[PDB]
Amino acid sequence: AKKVIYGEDARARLKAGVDKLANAVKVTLGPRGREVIIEKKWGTPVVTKDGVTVAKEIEFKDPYENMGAQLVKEVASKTSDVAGDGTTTATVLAQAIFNEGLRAIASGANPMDIKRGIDKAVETVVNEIKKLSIPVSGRKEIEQVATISANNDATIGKIIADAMEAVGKDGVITVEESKSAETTLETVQGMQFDRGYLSPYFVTNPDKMEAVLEDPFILIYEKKISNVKDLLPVLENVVRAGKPLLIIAEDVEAEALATLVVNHIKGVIRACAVKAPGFGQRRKDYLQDIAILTGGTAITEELGIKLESVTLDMLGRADKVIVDKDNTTIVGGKGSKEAIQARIEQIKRQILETTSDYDREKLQERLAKLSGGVAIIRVGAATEAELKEKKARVEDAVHATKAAVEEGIVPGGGVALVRASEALDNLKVDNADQQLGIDIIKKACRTPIRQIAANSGFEGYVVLEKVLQLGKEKGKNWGFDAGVGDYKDMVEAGIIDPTKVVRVAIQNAASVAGTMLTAEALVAEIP
Amino acid sequence: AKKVIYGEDARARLKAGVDKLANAVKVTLGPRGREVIIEKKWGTPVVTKDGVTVAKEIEFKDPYENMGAQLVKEVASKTSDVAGDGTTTATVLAQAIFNEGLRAIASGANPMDIKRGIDKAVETVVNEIKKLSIPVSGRKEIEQVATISANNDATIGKIIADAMEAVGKDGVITVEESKSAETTLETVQGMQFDRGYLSPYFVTNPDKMEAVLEDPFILIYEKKISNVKDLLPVLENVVRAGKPLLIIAEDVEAEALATLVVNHIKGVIRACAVKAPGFGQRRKDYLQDIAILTGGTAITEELGIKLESVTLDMLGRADKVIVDKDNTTIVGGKGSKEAIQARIEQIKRQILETTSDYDREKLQERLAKLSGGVAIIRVGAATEAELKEKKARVEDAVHATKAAVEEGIVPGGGVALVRASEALDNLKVDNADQQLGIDIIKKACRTPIRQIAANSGFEGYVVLEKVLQLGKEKGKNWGFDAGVGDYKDMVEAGIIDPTKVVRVAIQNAASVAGTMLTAEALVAEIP
Amino acid sequence: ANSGFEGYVVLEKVLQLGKEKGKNWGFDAGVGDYKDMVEAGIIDPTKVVRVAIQNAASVAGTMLTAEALVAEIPE
């Protein structure tokens, strides 16, 4: 059984649902925003300042108020997926657009024309933001963006700035929970994977459980090694060279492995055998990456080269390999620069499509493995409750730092939307109702700065008026520093946020709020 | 369906939840603290004085009050995991920080700045505690620490002091329930495991049921022995030496075992065979630990030596072994007294990284087996109900004794926190709200001493004033002896607790309590 | 407690001042400090203190051993 409600009754339900969701999220906005404790059915409650985390939990008993809440939750969800930051700003913007749109509709405006006017205004606002955008000069902007996104935490900003330099432009940064109270940065350069150490007898550094080979030969072969007859020819010729030998396969069984280890103990060869990483389809690409990095080729099942007939011609080579209990690293063969570049070009071309289908984001890691490096930031705290909140802030700053490199940086503290909203004064349209939609965006763009002031104990309208006039007297980058409560140049002070975050937040907020305003009836099941 | 509460209503719920949990735990604090009986659904109720045990059982009907209770339970849980003692002190500290933080916030202070001020004060307090820390000189402090942590039980302190000396600096102490009413200490030196006595006919002393062998040869072979054709060649050469032979194998069955027992009865050899300890990978390392201690080499499938091809060259040796119905003990390998130090260093280097992996002392047991010994304290009482509480106190004193060796000892009775809080008078910060956070820690650090006095029937504020003034008139170590009710030197009187416990308690209490103070809204499901 | 101080803390210090200073030393509630009561003029007739404790103990003892209460049913 369904019930349908119409007109002002329908919009009243939607407004109540949107307001109750937005009121919970908006308390976390700004440098003086406060956190929200979320009940978890099993275990410790979650304390968080993250906007999308709070929004994802909200749900209401009233079927019609819930519909309003669930629509605005999409604003925070989409912003997190695309930018990873600005979810609270997007939620604040969505409420402002919806609330002002209802006032215009209540005056008799056409709901569809308001949406058309809103779309035109957002196109102008996004263009203005890109004009204010400044490309990241280097470490100074990176450390400033990380500090601001981490809720003004210079310790986190320093670590992320170091991580960006270590892995470079094409590297990847991963955030994990440390097992101790300290927060550490761990960087590894070159190829590595989660396999190795088929037997303890390959020890070369007993003080560290490390198997170390210098200028080793790398054997990339798919299937098992299960007998001496085929393993001997590969061993029969590496002895002549005298260089160390490394074996990568799915496994080496007892009859096969006992040959090398009894040979390794006597020192006729210095070698080690490791299992090939991955499963199923995901095998060949890694070994192909490993083979192309080593300057040799991968012995492939499709290739048909019998293990007996192999030689030193296609045997791979590296400079240094380190093997431990569960990990092996290859420094690099520094070969095939153009060939790997094609895979780098292709993988990123595949990423933009495979990101909607892959099981894990490790496809990006495949790019970084043969072209850059990976950095692991292990967040640590005295307790689990503090660690969860600290780790979330680090993830937000990592995402914001990545977004800043792509599209530059913009004045923070909500100044960018205030500056962009000024151009809407010159945007005139012939339709009266579409003009109301433009006016809605102008008021909405100036809402985040007022909420930041309100959270810090200042009047939003007083702060907004000063910031508007300071744009003419001092410059476009001047704003309000809610941390200490005075006006200054935001870009010089380091209060900046990425252009991508600001652009995505206004676009997502307008798309949902504009769609909701066109509604006239709500259909929901009777409880 | 969620409901969100804000501001003072939210903090009122949290304070009620924290207070109700803390009130139950705090009755167990001090030498005159009393016990709590916890209902168990099936069986006898549990009577305990353990702070974390009481905290773990607390749960409330109100979802918002339960949120406060579950967060503070993390303070007691983390303290028990890290130090094993001081869980009641940590819970008392957490309530004091949270209660005083709410008062500051109600006056208009910024919650985030209070947390920053709290963090600075804890850093100073921890530094001061390490200044007061005195390293453990020997048995005198070990007995004093064990006695205090066992609730002033001298008999328990004596036993633990003996156990520490027996196993040495690198041994391990295990607490178990005795089958009788007496409490006994049992110490064994050297390697031992839970296998042995494949056949009852291997008897050297029929009075005591064991198979003592003098200067035996130890045969470390991984797989099964199941034929005469391979056992006999190894038997062909042990007879020449005339020394006894010990077999460690996967399983000796009828056909293989019948050879020795018939031969053993005839007296041509004196030998015994035992089960190999462990399963899976836990097999591999154990015989490796046995092989290195005995001076021989383990005959693994990996090594590549067949059973009939073995000889005296790699056969292990020992001075004397004891094998009984369920235990085999090797008392001395007479070799590799230099190699094990490298092995020892390799082990704890793995131990610290595998602290995330292990859930049983087997990680340290293997290290303790070869480098030291193990001591089993079997707690006994006339009744199961009394035994449960007595065993808990013994475990607390064992953990405290271990923690005292690591980081030294500090004046007890809450004096250390009082002395450390004095340095907070000199700590000034530029932000007014951060100063309130420092003042919160100063009051919190002086709460445990007042609660100990309150449990003993004295006035806490009167006791605190005297202890503060005695710090300069008499010395820093002077405090209040709540057991008898007079002031004296705590270090001379033996009222001391480990530095690690005091440091861990304040750090865990501040991390959780500081995090909760930044909360503004609570999201919980409607019941 | 009525004046805004902890009752047991005040009582404990008044007991201490009974032998450090003298028997007449107590706590002044008009201004929160300890002083000699007789010199300060904070004195009571000894009949009041004597009769109050005697009267209070008499009624309390009567009610402690009361075994039955007889009253009319309110309609």
Ligand SMILES: Nc1ncnc2c1ncn2[C@@H]1O[C@H](COP(=O)(O)OP(=O)(O)NP(=O)(O)O)[C@@H](O)[C@H]1O
């Ligand atoms: N010191 C400051 N003074 C003024 N504005 C600031 C300051 N620090 C940060 N901001 C601004 O405050 C906003 C950041 O607050 P934050 O709580 O991260 O909002 P969000 O990014 O929209 N949500 P989340 O997904 O939770 O990070 C941005 O607009 C910053 O530019």
Ligand SMILES: Nc1ncnc2c1ncn2[C@@H]1O[C@H](COP(=O)(O)OP(=O)(O)NP(=O)(O)O)[C@@H](O)[C@H]1O
């Ligand atoms: N005779 C004593 N006089 C004064 N203080 C004492 C005395 N004995 C112990 N204490 C102190 O009282 C505290 C020990 O009480 P205890 O009940 O063990 O607290 P906890 O260790 O925080 N909780 P638990 O985990 O249950 O042991 C420490 O601060 C001791 O220094």
Ligand SMILES: [Mg+2]
């Ligand atoms: Mg952010």
Ligand SMILES: [Mg+2]
């Ligand atoms: Mg204790």
